[PDB]
Amino acid sequence: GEHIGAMIQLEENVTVPMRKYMPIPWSKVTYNNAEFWDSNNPTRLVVPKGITKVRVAGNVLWDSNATGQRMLRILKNGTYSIGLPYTRDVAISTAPQNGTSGVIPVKEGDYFEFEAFQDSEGDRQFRADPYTWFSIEAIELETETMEKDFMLIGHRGATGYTDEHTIKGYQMALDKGADYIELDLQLTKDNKLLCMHDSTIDRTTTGTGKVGDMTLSYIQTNFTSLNGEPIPSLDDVLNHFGTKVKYYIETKRPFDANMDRELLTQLKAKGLIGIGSERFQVIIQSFARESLINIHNQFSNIPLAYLTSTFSESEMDDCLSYGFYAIAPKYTTITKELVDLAHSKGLKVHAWTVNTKEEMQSLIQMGVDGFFTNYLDEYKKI
Amino acid sequence: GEHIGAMIQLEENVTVPMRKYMPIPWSKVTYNNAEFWDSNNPTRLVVPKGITKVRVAGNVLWDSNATGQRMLRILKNGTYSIGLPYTRDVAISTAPQNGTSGVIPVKEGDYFEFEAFQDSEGDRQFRADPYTWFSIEAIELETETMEKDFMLIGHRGATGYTDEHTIKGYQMALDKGADYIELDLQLTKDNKLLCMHDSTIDRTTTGTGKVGDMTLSYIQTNFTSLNGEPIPSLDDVLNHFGTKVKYYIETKRPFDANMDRELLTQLKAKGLIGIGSERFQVIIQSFARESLINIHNQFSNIPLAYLTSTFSESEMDDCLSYGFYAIAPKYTTITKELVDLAHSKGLKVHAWTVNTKEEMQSLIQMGVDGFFTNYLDEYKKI
Amino acid sequence: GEHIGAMIQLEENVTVPMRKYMPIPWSKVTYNNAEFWDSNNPTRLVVPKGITKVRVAGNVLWDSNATGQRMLRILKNGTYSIGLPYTRDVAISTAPQNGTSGVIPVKEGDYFEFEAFQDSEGDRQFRADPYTWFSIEAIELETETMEKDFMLIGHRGATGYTDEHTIKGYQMALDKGADYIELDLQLTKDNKLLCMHDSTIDRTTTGTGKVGDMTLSYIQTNFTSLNGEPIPSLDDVLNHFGTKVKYYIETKRPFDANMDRELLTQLKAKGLIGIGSERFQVIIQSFARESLINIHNQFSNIPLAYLTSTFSESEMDDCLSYGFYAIAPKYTTITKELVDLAHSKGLKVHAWTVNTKEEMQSLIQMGVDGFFTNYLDEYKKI
Predict the structure, then answer these.
(1) Separation of alpha carbons C306 and C294, rounded Å
(2) What are phi and psi of C304, to 5 degrees?
(3) Where does the record place the GP-PDE domain (chains A, B, C) (predicted)?
(4) CATH 1.20.1250.20 fits B5-140, yes or no
(5) DSSP string of A14-46?
(6) Of B351, B349, B323, B330, the residue nearest B338 (C-alpha)
């Protein structure tokens, strides 16, 4: 490919008053691929639209003075940010300072400023020298994410029209127009995962007892759903659908690291997550914030949704702090004011358990970004 | 892809005399993809042919001594260069020093040397330690640029055979063999751009008055060229030709930032410049050096040409200093000596207003790299 | 593409005892593409499976204290490694420290730890601040290398069935199933390379005298093999086969830099080595370790094999130290114990001059990775 980035340097020495922080007004450009700098805003390196992650670095050269300290610092949007360099050291002769940042995320409109500080008697000269430069590099570029402005979820297999949590039900939901299928998983006596909602299988299947009481093979062989359909495991569903379908997955409210570890291993084995996966092909939700944090610490690219029944500004702020992709409040608690507030904060709002066309239309008017509907065709009836 | 770069390290400690600058004679290679190092020139990391931009970094480890200062410095071609690291700090214990360069341009034959300096009593040992290494990385690789050794420009739409500055004229020039079409632009009463040469439209069109006196719509609707052809705007020409054609554009001699800003916005909107554009698909010329500098500060990849009528070594040196791609002197002032001098400096020479076959042949013998010819087929008659 | 890497940071300040080295127990993740960090091993950044080269960097922020020194250090697998940063400097105020590593090789399971050291009175606080982070980036990813688990070499052109070192012989060996053809080269009176085994051409060709006595043209025109076949030069063989075939090349036991330089130039001219080449499409062997070192210093990606007749642990250790790909001991000296020892060290074992099916089967039972067989079809008779 071709390098994307820019580098700027001074043409005349800048004077730094003693013990005062000062962004450097860079004057000329060594090179600039596309609009990384603006003449009317010399102190700022601006990130253009088509960039997601950048690397920033610079170097400094002062006039000969062996007193006080010198500082090299880079600020994002005029304030501190993660992954930026910072250096202080004793000054001898010109006391050059060099620093480089790690790969950090950014968005259109973000800017970086080179900040300098000195503690020597009198003013100091920020020399315009080949060893005095400010550079920014683009590491990641925007690309199609498979995301949709509105997402329709086949709530628990679209059981409103057929049996719940079965391959036939998932296929019917996809045919009816489901954007995402919802999967509920529990561990059997073995480490394998079984697709069911209730902890006890008696409600949904001819069998009885907890899912963890017996092995996966016995449960899948000796028992079947009330409609006689097979009880598919996670591996079976993944093999049947593969990458053709986007999956919505819920974890246990009672947090357990083994469940998340097994789910992540199974998902990575099929390539649905990780280096070779698509960002939005899989979405994970959970009432347990700890499970979401654990998943994020391992796979940060996986979008996460937080399930709650107390939609409020506190919950939205908490979700924004941890970087969750969306918040899933109960539909009864949603109002246009809260939806607008969430959109301002950058969070997506999904209403779950929507089963009436009038309520669906009201939520659409409220601007809700997605629904978990047991009945799917009502969306077409709007 | 695969990583391209090299890293070298010492096998025996090097002795650095007090207060003397010394390139480090590196002895062994940790890894080297392709000819980045030479045994007979240990102090130099050499850039192979197929590289355009590189990143250089290194680290140092000295013997235990808490007196004086230590220096880390990298030189290009034995002299200072932009974007290279430089560090000095007080020495405690081994006083390791680390530095990294930004992305900088290079060409085949360029080399980088690791320079060290110390100010402690007696000699110091440049220890051969895993924390003492010199590395160079390749960021950008050479690729097809769409450039041509000789460029024929359809001077102002090849008006010698048809009407000037119209879509039909541009198409005729392209058919006759024009490599680049020349566009002259002025702002209307609105911010839109109109393709014309003279400030007043009476000479070229049935209308009259300055282009900025009235809006684009009125000018394009109520007026037409003396041949009855439409008066195309920049957007119309770009839509008609798109990326199929390479454009030559001239800016106003009286510098005005609004003109350049609008031109750049229009060009980027079509993808002719910026991240996704081809380097040589667009060329910009101007008598105003300030306009060229302003364009370069925003889009450094766009080749720039300087129009002048006083071809001299001073102008060539000035253009080389600002990094212009070519110089466009008047054909009457061109001589083989000056063409050879320009080629030695690395600048391309384009002769403008060439309308005779004998003069064209003479200039070709002089080695001129391109012509702005009102009559195009004469080039085929050579 | 998409960025692959991770960055971690502290959530609570860590206390560093005076004059003690301490890996930093990082607590939270800023971002992590795929399994670069583990909660139960906070101090370690772990390299996943699909990575070959990485870049590691970090930054530190201490509490305000102007006494003693501060250290920034990164360790690989709990010990020192090449290409990692190291910095010590005098402390003023918070004394931030920044460092970045060069591109270094890695393998699955390798981990990096951030080590800190301070020499101030009392304990120091490793502040959890946006300017305190630990990052690792992936530069190179695993890709198909064209390598094979077992390699069959057409020993000196498979002369057992036809004439040695001729295009017809090489083609016959390839047809019979040869994975690699073996080439023996010597310099003629000119710098060109001639494909022959013996220094004197009388044994293999109708001519006589040393290869260097006369020019390539005279040797190739006035002389022919005992079977009347042409005496091909290296360029002729490369043109005839090009990239369709993988080459095995041997250099002179008496080291001479001119031979290696000419061979490398010829190979690069055809693209068989360098930036655009495939790693395992060419293999070079030599009895002279100096020649292998010289080739490695210029092209580190070329796999190298060491020819010896004294198979022993000392030779395997020496080859591992210099990073040779394989060791080629005499078949009579090979035993399953030594093959297992070589495999534990990571070296491949090739037995040369194997011309009996029983010995070939015995070596296969020993686990030998390849054979140089004058008779090829015996491998199919196993």
Answers:
(1) 13
(2) -125, 145
(3) 150-382
(4) no
(5) EEE-TT--EE----EEEEESSS-EETTEEEEEE
(6) B349
Domain(s) of CATH 2.60.120.40: residues in chain B: 5-140
Q: Enumerate residues 92 to 111 of chain A having a beta carbon within 8 A of any beta carbon in chain C.
A: 99-100, 102-105
Q: How many CB atoms lie within 10 A of CB A179?
A: 18
> Counting beta carbons within 10 angstroms of the beta carbon of residue A222, is it exposed (0 to 12), middle (13 to 18) or buried (19 or more)?
exposed
10 Å CB burial of residue C380 (0-12, 13-18, 19+) is exposed
Min distance A32 CA to chain B CA atoms (Å)? 5
Q: Do A90 and B88 touch (CB under 8 A)?
A: no
- Comparing CB atoms, the residue among A88, A102, A296 nearest residue C133 is A102
Please name every residue paired with A370 in a beta bridge, in sequence order, or none if there are none: A151, A350
Asked if C39 and A89 come within 8 Å (Cβ–Cβ), the reply is no
DSSP symbol at B142: -
* Residue found by looking up tokens 């690729």 in the block: B143
- Which amino acid is residue A61, in one-letter code? L
B-chain residues near C53 (CB < 8 A): 3
- By residue count, chain A amounts to 382
Both tokens of B275, joined, read 């991240």
Q: Which of chain A's residues have a Cβ under 8 Å away from the Cβ of B104?
A: 7
Residues of A in contact with B19 (CB under 8 A): none
Which CATH number is associated with domain C151-379? 3.20.20.190
The catalytic site residues of C sit at 155, 197
Cα–Cα distance measured from residue A55 to residue A105, given in angstroms and rounded to the nearest whole number: 9
H or E, element range at B204: none
Strand-pair category, A348-352 with B97-100: unpaired
**How many pairs of residues across B and C have Cβ atoms under 8 Å apart?**
100
Cβ <8 Å between A29 and B103: no
Beta bridge partners of B70: B89, B118
For the question of residue A165 being annotated catalytic, the response is no
Judge whether A197 counts as a catalytic residue. Answer: yes
B60: β partners: B97
Strand partners, C179: none
Elucidation method: cryo-EM
| Resolution of the structure, angstroms | 3.2
Give the chains touching B; criterion: ≥3 Cβ pairs < 8 Å.
Answer: A, C
Q: Minimal CA–CA distance to A96: which of B88, C307, B132?
A: B88
Kind plus residue range of the DSSP H or E element containing A271: none
A58 in helix, strand or coil?
A: strand
C-alpha to C-alpha distance for B55 and B27, rounded to whole angstroms: 21
Cβ contact (<8 Å) for B3 and C143? no
> Exposed (0-12), middle (13-18) or buried (19+): which is A61, by Cβ within 10 Å?
buried
Residue C357: how many CB atoms within 10 A of its CB? 16
Residue A91, CA atoms < 13 Å, CB-side half-sphere: 21
Environment class of C103 (CB within 10 Å of its CB; exposed 0-12, middle 13-18, buried 19+): buried
Q: Quick check: C39 and A99 CB within 8 A?
A: no
Chains with 3+ CB–CB pairs under 8 A to A are B, C
β A180-187/A247-250 pair status? parallel
Contact assignment for A299 to C95 by CB distance below 8 Å = no
CB C215 within 8 A of CB C151: no
For residue B1, how many other CB atoms are within 10 A of its CB?
A: 11
Quote the CA–CA distance of B248 and B305 in Å, as a whole number.
10
* Start-end of CATH 3.20.20.190 domains in chain C: 151-379
A29 touches chain C (CB under 8 A): no
Cβ of B87 under 8 Å from any chain A Cβ? Answer: yes
E strand or H helix that includes residue B261: helix B257-269
Q: C137 and A102: CB-CB below 8 Å? A: yes
B105 Cβ contact partners less than 8 Å away, ≥ 6 residues apart: A31, B52, B53
Q: Does A64 touch chain B (CB under 8 A)?
A: no
